[PDB]
Amino acid sequence: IVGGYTCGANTVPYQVSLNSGYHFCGGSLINSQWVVSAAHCYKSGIQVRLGEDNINVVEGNEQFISASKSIVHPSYNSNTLNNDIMLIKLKSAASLNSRVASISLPTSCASAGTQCLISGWGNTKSSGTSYPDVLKCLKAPILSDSSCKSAYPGQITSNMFCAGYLEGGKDSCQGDSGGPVVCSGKLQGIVSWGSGCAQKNKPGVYTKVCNYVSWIKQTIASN
Ligand SMILES: [Ca+2]
């Protein structure tokens, strides 16, 4: 997260880190046994880390649980990042409490101008690289589909939305991928892509979660 703030330990209780010996992506806990992330985050051998603040120090609220299975969206296109969504099942249910908690799926698609909370352990620099050890947070509005398409001609599908600031300075970044965009207490986006981070006229592009609620619910019900 570029141009964000330190969230505070366990203030984003649905935020998970995906670990394969190291943090590589974020995710969102949507019930005691399932995580939503970005399909471009797929790999084998995932350990889900819940209850994290400092991802390099054991602070006392962690739960580390290996994934039993991953399900990439059946229409994921890695070239276009259309349908950049995957589900990860935990081998055992997490223990839920105020510091480790699921986030609800949306009932409604959020609109342009709605304020959302974007969070992650990704790069905090637009130029060069600095990884934080603690969770970073950013409040950002959803942008109009017209401003989104104008920023990224030929690239924005009906399964994407832009959020952030056309002026630059404030954005998600590398290492935030798969993490949450939460608006009015519901998971509306997944950190997906952007051209660099926090560059002018290159806002963040997010998977549009409201399009996937039927697929998520049906997939969980049978797996
Ligand atoms: Ca920790």
Author numbering: 19 to 241
What do the authors report?
ID30A-3 (or MASSIF-3) is a mini-focus (beam size 18 µm × 14 µm) highly intense (2.0 × 1013 photons s−1), fixed-energy (12.81 keV) beamline for macromolecular crystallography (MX) experiments at the European Synchrotron Radiation Facility (ESRF). MASSIF-3 is recommended for collecting diffraction data from single small crystals (≤15 µm in one dimension) or for experiments using serial methods.
Crystals appeared after a few days and were cryo-protected using 20% (w/v) glycerol. As can be seen in Table 2, the two data sets are of comparable quality (automatic processing using EDNAproc) with both giving clear structure solutions, requiring only little additional refinement (adding waters, benzamidine and other buffer molecules, adjusting side chains, etc.), using the ESRF automatic molecular replacement pipeline.
